[PDB]
Design a protein around this nucleic acid. Structure first.
Length: 448
DNA sequence: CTCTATGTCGGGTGCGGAGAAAGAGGTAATGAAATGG
DNA sequence: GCCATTTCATTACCTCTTTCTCCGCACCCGACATAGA
């Protein structure tokens, strides 16, 4: 059961407030498929607060508080958790004799003060004196390592039982969120829904261009900047631009500025068109990449076609995107516009990538200039991210496409738990044969 | 003549990148107190 | 209670990311003029 306010992800990918979800509607299953609701358990109880942990620190100005994943449930809500399997060996001495130890995480049981019989994870140790010889020990260690396939346990525990966990286990316990595997085709239907009728590279190229525009584009013309130096990118531009059937008006004249002109009438002389008869623009406005005068990453994109979701970032990254590879594939977009920040994060995750932003306060300096609140949104995620990069043109950005059928597994997150005051709670119940867990809106995986 | 799309101009500031710090969980290593026979 | 493990939170580091931050000038954006319409 959830505290009132908590937003849910509906199977159609919309977002509905928990208190308003009725019976018969279909929530989002971690598999992207629908999870029907059959009961609206309501009531009053003691509520608990959740909130991811993180290397974040700047406080204690109103420097915005992070976008940390969070939610609030009653004391008996089941937390879909995970805990690593761990086995360490150790040699210690007491009462004279020194022995061998075999510390391990194994799921046992423990008595809740309230009397209940709770199934959880416990730290277990088995030991005998060094006299016998490290042989017995070394045996179990593998007889464990070689016990189960998954490197972690996947169980459930009620907020109110969490304390029951020992120190070591507690710390080594996290919750997870899953990627938005569902898929609308709003992008596609839109494309088909218009006058212009292009090839089957549209959704792709168009997507890629919208990506670049957002990053290095101009906010009042279907034109944008480029690094006179990245040639590969340069071509991509022409190519994709050409496929949408438009022109690349390259002008590096004292970095490079281009303009994507329609092949329409030119006007009387040469004073070509760029915004007119241009799908790019027809969309920027159509799909909402330009809300109320400022750029923006439209939310519908978080729930649309993955390919397209990918390609778009591809574009964003090819302009305003710095990539490295030294200790893992990672990419960093920098912005100053909230909408851009947000919209991007919500999208970034939809894929399964790990995201974290870092604001930089306004400033004013020696040049006496007034800087602005800046955001350095950070991403990573092995394959998932790679498969995006594989769709890049930039030299320093491009990266080969993952093996294949790379799994879009859930990402876990360490959190904090807080005891709140009793309060009305709303919960929903799914049909039996399902997994009994649905995804929230901030992509966090929860049980009903 | 008025109302929009295209070039195009000048000023103040977005962001580019990298290196480093500051957290966060994992490990041993302890000190001892609880369990079962 | 003697024995012989176990259980457990805390301690001092230990590894690994991911949050921060630094700063000037080439470039981004608002401002303006002018071919269309």
């Amino acid at each position: 059961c959830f505290a009132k306010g908590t937003n849910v992800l509906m199977a159609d990918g919309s977002i509905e407030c928990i208190e308003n979800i009725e019976v018969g509607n279909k929530v989002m299953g971690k598999d992207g498929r629908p999870r029907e609701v059959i009961k609206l358990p309501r009531g009053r109880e003691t509520m608990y607060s959740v909130v991811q942990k993180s290397q974040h620190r700047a406080h204690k100005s109103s420097r915005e508080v992070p976008e940390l994943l969070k939610f609030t449930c009653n004391a008996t809500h089941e937390l879909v958790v995970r805990t690593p399997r761990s086995v360490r060996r150790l040699s210690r001495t007491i009462k004279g004799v020194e022995y061998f130890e075999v510390i391990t995480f194994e799921m046992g049981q423990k008595k809740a003060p309230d009397g209940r019989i709770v199934e959880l994870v416990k730290e277990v140790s088995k030991s005998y004196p060094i006299s016998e010889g490290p042989e017995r020990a070394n045996e179990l260690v593998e007889s464990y390592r070689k016990a189960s396939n998954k490197a972690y346990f996947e169980w459930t525990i009620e907020a109110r039982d969490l304390s029951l966990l020992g120190s070591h286990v507690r710390k080594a316990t996290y919750q997870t969120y899953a990627p938005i595997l569902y898929e609308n085709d709003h992008f596609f239907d839109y494309m088909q829904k218009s006058k212009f009728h292009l090839t089957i590279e549209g959704p792709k190229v168009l997507a890629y261009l919208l990506g670049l525009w957002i990053g290095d584009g101009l906010s009042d013309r279907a034109t944008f900047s480029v690094d006179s130096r990245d040639t590969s990118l340069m071509e991509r531009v022409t190519e994709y631009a050409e496929k949408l059937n438009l022109c690349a008006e390259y002008k590096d004249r004292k970095a490079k500025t281009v303009n994507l002109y329609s092949k329409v009438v030119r006007g009387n002389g040469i004073r070509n068109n760029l915004n007119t008869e241009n799908p790019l623009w027809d969309a920027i406005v159509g799909l909402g990449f330009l809300k109320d005068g400022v750029k923006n990453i439209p939310s519908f994109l978080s729930t649309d076609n993955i390919g397209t979701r990918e390609t778009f970032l591809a574009g964003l990254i090819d302009s305003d995107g710095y990539v490295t590879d030294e200790h893992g594939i990672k990419a960093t977009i920098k912005t100053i516009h909230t909408s851009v920040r947000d919209g991007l994060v919500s999208l970034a995750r939809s894929l399964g990538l790990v995201v974290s932003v870092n604001a930089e306060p306004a400033k004013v300096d020696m040049n006496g200039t007034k800087h602005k609140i800046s955001y350095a949104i950070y991403m990573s995620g092995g394959d998932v991210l790679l498969n995006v990069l594989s769709k890049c043109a930039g030299s320093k950005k491009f990266r080969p496409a993952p093996a294949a059928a790379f799994a879009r597994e859930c990402r876990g997150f360490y959190f904090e738990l807080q005891e709140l005051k009793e309060d009305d709670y709303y919960g929903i119940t799914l049909s039996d044969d399902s997994d009994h867990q649905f995804l929230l809106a901030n992509q966090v995986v929860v049980h009903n």
